[PDB]
Amino acid sequence: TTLLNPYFGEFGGMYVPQILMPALNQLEEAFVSAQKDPEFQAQFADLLKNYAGRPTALTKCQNITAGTRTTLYLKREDLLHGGAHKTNQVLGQALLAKRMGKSEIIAETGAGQHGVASALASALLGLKCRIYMGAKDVERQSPNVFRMRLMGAEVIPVHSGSATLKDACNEALRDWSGSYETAHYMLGTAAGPHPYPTIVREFQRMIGEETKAQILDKEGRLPDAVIACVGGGSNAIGMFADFINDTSVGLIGVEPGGHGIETGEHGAPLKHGRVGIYFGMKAPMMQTADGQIEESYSISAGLDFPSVGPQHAYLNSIGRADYVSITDDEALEAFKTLCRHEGIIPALESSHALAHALKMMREQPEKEQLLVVNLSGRGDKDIFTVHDILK
Amino acid sequence: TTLLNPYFGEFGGMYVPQILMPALNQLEEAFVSAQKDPEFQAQFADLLKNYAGRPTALTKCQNITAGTRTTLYLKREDLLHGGAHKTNQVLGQALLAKRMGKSEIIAETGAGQHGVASALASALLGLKCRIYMGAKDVERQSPNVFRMRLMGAEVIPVHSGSATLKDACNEALRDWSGSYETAHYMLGTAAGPHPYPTIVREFQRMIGEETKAQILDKEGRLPDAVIACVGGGSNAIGMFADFINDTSVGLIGVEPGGHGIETGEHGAPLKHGRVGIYFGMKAPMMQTADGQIEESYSISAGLDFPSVGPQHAYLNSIGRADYVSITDDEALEAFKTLCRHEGIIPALESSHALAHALKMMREQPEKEQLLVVNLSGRGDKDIFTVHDILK
Amino acid sequence: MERYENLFAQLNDRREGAFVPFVTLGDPGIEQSLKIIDTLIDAGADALELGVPFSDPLADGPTIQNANLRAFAAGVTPAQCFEMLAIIREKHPTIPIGLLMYANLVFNNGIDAFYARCEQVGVDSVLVADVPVEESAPFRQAALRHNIAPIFICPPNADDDLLRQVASYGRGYTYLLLIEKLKEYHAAPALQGFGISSPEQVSAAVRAGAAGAISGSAIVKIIEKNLASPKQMLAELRSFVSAMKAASR
Amino acid sequence: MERYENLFAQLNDRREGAFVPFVTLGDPGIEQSLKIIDTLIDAGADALELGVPFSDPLADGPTIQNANLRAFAAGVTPAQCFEMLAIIREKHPTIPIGLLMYANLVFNNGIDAFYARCEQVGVDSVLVADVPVEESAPFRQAALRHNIAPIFICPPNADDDLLRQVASYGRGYTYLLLIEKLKEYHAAPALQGFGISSPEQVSAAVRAGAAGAISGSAIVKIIEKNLASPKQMLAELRSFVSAMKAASR
């Protein structure tokens, strides 16, 4: 028994051990309550505005599209406090934890962005925060690890399995199984068991709502398409949400193609994976022929979630949203292109979205189109990675 | 002959070789013209808003002041595009360069923040950018150096003299002496020869204007004091400007005390230096008894300017503004305090301002006071520096 | 078949509790695992609960997580586990055999096909660790079609509604992690799991009204501790199981 | 005194141009600098333009920047430069001596005190590199009070207004970087600076109507090139200055 539908077509559900169901029902109930509570809305709006920096800008990029009939706008989540869209929903989930009288937060992270976002929200709202991070990721994200500790969060390495995000995902659930009475599991993407896909979307939907208002203000009409990278699906569903009922608006999700789909070294489960049941949901997954879960590869560590939010798989199934992939090289070129022509350093994650937009423009330069790319985050953190590759 | 007064009391002036005076008069004339040009204002407002992310937030910090009668707000310039207030004025100066039909930009930088800001503004507005940076600073700011190049700017190391900011300052002027016809020197702080102190203040004054409006909205009255760090003086004069005629509002500038004023290892020329004539202006300077210019020391590389804007020296002389200093250790503590209690990582520069505010609060916890600290920038860039020191 | 029903009836006819040990198939190797299992049975195990190694066992503690690591290090695959299951059933015709699975290994090549494979090798029950009764429909339906008892965990934080469901949906045995209410709703015989690592806990379980007890990790711990000596491993396993079984009598 | 006036009158009485070499006091060392200077004079220099090493010579090219580095490496200070100036004047009573200064070294211990010190050691003129005529009031006033001629640069991008000012404010000589207009406004005799590195440029300067030429860096380049051999340095300096002076005749 649930208050909201846990499924998006055949995808989604609550595939967790029986011991975790009460925690999920409790969470669902608190969210439904909070959503109809004007005081909760006002408090969340206040943090978003006065703490995180919302609304974010909608930047028109004229240099990049010169000579073409493409008009491109970038929704500036890179300007959000923390440098990425991750901040929007952790603030909402933190407020939900408090509403449930919870005083501790459990969070998982791969590249460290979510860990840092959970830690900053916990610091602000007086919550004790413990973060699980795959030992392999701990080793390669020292900066983000220190930021977490600087903010008072307890960082715990995970050596089990592949010692990456998925292994951090299991460890978090394990912990929560026996601490949910006083602790809230702050899941980092629009995936996992219900009500998380729904909750994260709702707490990221201001991205699309702002974008709609801004584009109408500046162009007097809706975009022909909005484009966003898809690691787990949060920034994308955040951007897409408010436009779903606007049938004339294309929704384009970009999965990491890595070294190339045909090489098998990618992170595009939605279009190249296989439906499975893992991390509490039925969704497309990166897995072996035998059913073992595999890692997603990408030059961008943030697009590492080996699956994808169930609402995206559903939007794809009915044809409402289209999903494509962008390789490491295409994303690297988009990254350099934005730095040089617009003076904005995009996160390598966001660069995938930008790269597809660049492709839409370049392939048909005389096609009149109004596009919005969700610039999910800033790429100062990627300066080293890109550095090595170049020259 | 000038259109505006080049002096603030005895401080300021235009102490440059005769060959540079036409460039300064030309610049002054363009600025005066631009200031009364609504189209220039609208274009500058548009970039500030839709590109840089203005207005920035005014964040109330409740956790940090708990148990005291101090109410503290942080003006969030760390949320500005680029991560610091530097961006405001480079956009204005870039627009001025174009207004003068200039197509190239010359800029100086120590910690690299200004270099990066000049480079991003140049990229956005189609300007060819060359930046001078002391070889010693080039060596210790590889990240910012790469960011500059990623944005298309040409970075040129300076090995002359102490190979630091001051040496970069001379090299820029040298270049400009024989290229000002097509190139604009984008000075990085509220200092140097007239009209720069005036221009930078005016292009940073939105900081204080926004702060006033925001504080009136949220508290219904003006701050008892606004506090800002002072490296060269731009973020501080930016914050102070709009409040100067509000006599009930204290203006507090914080110079870096380094290892301690008494150790001589500091960067507080305004209160502990000696008036001299350098970098085109008469102002307090870090110099030997003989008249040779010395470097300013601070745990924070951004507070390295060995002098201070002439308007601050003037505001100090008449008693309108008060200047104090904060040591490396006090700034490190303020840095950790903000991370842990508010989930915001401040730039080590800004931390000096915060540290003084913390002192005002802690020394007299029962004193009712409404303070605003200008959080000039974010401290992700300082994560390494702080890392080493700790434990 | 009705191996659980026959086991519990026989155990009741002698006021005895059931002792069910759990091990991971292929841990630490196929050969050694088969020997471990034969030892567990010779020592007195009434039924077996066998895990199939999975990459992300989000419902298991370190003991089990490491057991899977050892198995994977040995190259154990689901296909090999099923070959093992067949061999085990061919040697022991009556002992109930239950699998502890993760939803994906069941759903991978089709749920019906999985349970059909279970029936073919002679498995008696299947507990899917990450499938709550709320999501169990296709699983229990498939299980029943192939004469496989679907097993459900009755958590500590359970309520009356969950108890009614577990009683209605489960078969073979109820995995207890209350006993009166379960009997009241005609639930499958309850076996006490979690924390069963000493004879007194077995006796305590039977005394509480449970039909038996499951040792979810103690067996695996003995394996873990004797990896260096296969012979000592079997010897210690025998002593432990023998001691645990006697406590059910 | 009126050393410049006496020099130019004497040069005119023989249709000769003035050749003024520039060097940095104390470059590459105090001892060697004094010898360099005595050599420049023995070779035919009509007047001297001497720089006092400053930390941030924002108005000088690499040649001069390096010259200051060498001097500072030798521990040369303004106080030592003034001791040198005294020694130089005591050996040569009539040659005009002009200093090329940076505002801070002049303003440091008080502007009047600086010019008073100049008069005391026998300096004739002072050009403050970073003080435009717009900011020169206290400097030229102090210079005149102490019988020191304030020198101003007449830049290429100059205009009529600047020309009138330079003519009105300068004394000794006008540092040219036009000649008719200067003479028209009764400006101090103009000396051509910038780019004077060959005899033909000297002759070209005098032919253009200038009273002479200043070699702003060529002398320093010769020093730079012969740092390894002090004796060859002096020898080459002599040949260069001798050649440059003959071209003014």
Ligand SMILES: *Cc1c(COP(=O)(O)O)cnc(C)c1O
């Ligand atoms: C974490 C991250 C992503 C990937 O996560 P989603 O949940 O797919 O949005 C994308 N962009 C940035 C900048 C991120 O930090």
Ligand SMILES: *Cc1c(COP(=O)(O)O)cnc(C)c1O
């Ligand atoms: C450059 C910088 C400063 C110092 O410069 P001012 O001109 O004194 O403002 C202060 N804060 C930040 C973050 C800076 O980048």
Ligand code: NA
């Ligand atoms: Na994914």
Ligand code: NA
């Ligand atoms: Na300073």
